[PDB]
């Protein structure tokens, strides 16, 4: 039948123009007293899913 989508993932990544996936960052919910001011604005950004993980999850997000 029609293949489904990892709904848990569709809420975490936006698809970018060259087919990349823009992801949000980790280590950013609490315990900020234990992380530096440098770590915090360099975590206030967006990175791309690394190609190794892309090879792992290509189909979980095929319809995005």
Partner 1 sequence: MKLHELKPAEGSRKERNRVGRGVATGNGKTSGRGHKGQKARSGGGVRPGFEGGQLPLFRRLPKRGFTNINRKEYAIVNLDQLNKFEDGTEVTPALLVESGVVKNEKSGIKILGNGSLDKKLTVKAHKFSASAAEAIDAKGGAHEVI
Partner RNA sequence: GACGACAUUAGACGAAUCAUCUGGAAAGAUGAAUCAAAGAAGGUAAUAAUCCUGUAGUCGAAAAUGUUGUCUCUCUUGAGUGGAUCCUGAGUACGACGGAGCACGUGAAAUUCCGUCGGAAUCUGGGAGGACCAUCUCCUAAGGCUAAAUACUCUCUAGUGACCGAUAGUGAACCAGUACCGUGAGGGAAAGGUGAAAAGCACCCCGGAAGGGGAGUGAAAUAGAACCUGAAACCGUGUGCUU
Partner RNA sequence: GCAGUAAAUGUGGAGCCGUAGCGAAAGCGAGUCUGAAUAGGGCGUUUAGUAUUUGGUCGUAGACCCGAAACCAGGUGAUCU
Partner RNA sequence: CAAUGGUAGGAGAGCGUUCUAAGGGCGUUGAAGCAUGAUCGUAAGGACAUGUGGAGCGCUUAGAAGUGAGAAUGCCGGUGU
Q: Is 25 left (phi over 0), alpha (psi -120 to 50) or beta?
A: beta
Q: Could you tell me the sign of the dihedral formed by the alpha carbons of 8, 12, 16, 18, in that order?
A: negative
Q: How far apart are the first and last CA of the chain?
A: 18
Report if residue 20 touches RNA, rule: CB under 7 A: yes
The residues that touch partner 1, with contacts defined as CB under 8 A, are 6, 8-9, 11-13, 23-26, 28-29, 49, 53, 56-57, 59-60
For residues 26 and 33, which CB has a smaller minimum distance to partner 1 in the complex?
Answer: 26
**Footprint on this chain of RNA (rule: CB under 7 A):** 1, 3-4, 14, 16-18, 20, 22, 44-46, 48, 59
């Amino acid at each position: 039948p029609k293949m489904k989508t990892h709904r848990g993932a569709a809420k975490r990544v936006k698809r970018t123009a060259s087919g990349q996936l823009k992801r949000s960052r980790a280590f950013t919910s609490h315990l900020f007293a234990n992380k530096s001011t440098k770590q915090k604005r360099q975590l206030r950004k967006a990175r791309l899913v690394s190609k190794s993980d892309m090879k792992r999850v290509k189909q979980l997000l095929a319809y995005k």
